Amino acid sequence: RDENKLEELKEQGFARIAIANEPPFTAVGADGKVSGAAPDVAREIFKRLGVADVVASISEYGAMIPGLQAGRHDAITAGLFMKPERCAAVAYSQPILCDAEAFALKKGNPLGLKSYKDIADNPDAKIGAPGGGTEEKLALEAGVPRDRVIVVPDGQSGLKMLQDGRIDVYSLPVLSINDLVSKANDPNVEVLAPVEGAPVYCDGAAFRKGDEALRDAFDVELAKLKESGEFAKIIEPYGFSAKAAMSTTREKLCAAK
């Protein structure tokens, strides 16, 4: 049942995927059509594997690995960036979506916040970030106390909290912040990208550890997409660099480094 997971999905007609609704990584249309770069790549590979559709579930990032391990979804296709800790819990594909981290800030950046350390250093500064996300962990690792790292469910709420003064900075990947701010039409909000001292991350699709045969099959198709140039045709309209993903590997991103 673990080694024949692909057969099960093919006979099912669909894979269940976990997403967060954070353009341009993931997005949901009014009609329910899931798109964004991660679901678009995943939908194309699954189709090539003979799985006709993807069925997307929205959750906050902290719920994704748990639900995957619990067998609730078949893959996480959400821009869930690779990290040693995550790599130990799931079977990742090779890299797909790469991005740096950004801040959304008050115009003029009055608190002079340019790094996660800057936030840790100012006891007034509160940062908003998705729960269980890389930004939240980077804030905590820089020494921002738990009570100044504020969980934010989604981008529109993060911007509203920033505008309202409930947080001083909201942090997401560069492409996500730029997309959100450009749609907001708020002259009193300002983007700093990339965050100084922050790592650049890449994601991949994540599978249950026991579903390694499905991960392999997914990876065979991903490699062919990369080789043909079809990979770039899918992700680059969303703002991603195919070169960046193709310059690295799962083992390098997952290494103790």
Give the binding range for ligand 4CS (CB under 6 A) out of 46-54, 126-134, 147-155, 184-192: 126-134
Number of residues that bind ligand 4CS (CB under 6 A): 12
Check residue 79 for interaction with ligand 4CS (CB under 6 A): yes
Residue 151 in 3-state DSSP? strand
Output the CA angle 78-256-69, nearest 5 degrees.
40
The single residue among 23, 133, 158, 204 that binds ligand 4CS, judged by CB under 6 A, is: 133
Residue 71 burial (CB < 10 Å; 0-12/13-18/19+)? Answer: exposed
Check residue 81 for interaction with ligand 4CS (CB under 6 A): yes
- Measured from the CB atom, is 51 or 175 closer to ligand 4CS? 175
Check residue 130 for interaction with ligand 4CS (CB under 6 A): yes
- Output the CA–CA distances (angstroms, integers) from residue 99 to 5, 163, 208, 232, 235, in the order listed: 31, 25, 24, 15, 12
Check residue 155 for interaction with ligand 4CS (CB under 6 A): no
Output the CA angle 127-128-131, nearest 5 degrees.
125
- Measured from the CB atom, is 6 or 134 closer to ligand 4CS? 134
Give the binding site for ligand 4CS (CB under 6 A).
22, 25, 61, 79-81, 130, 133-134, 172-173, 176
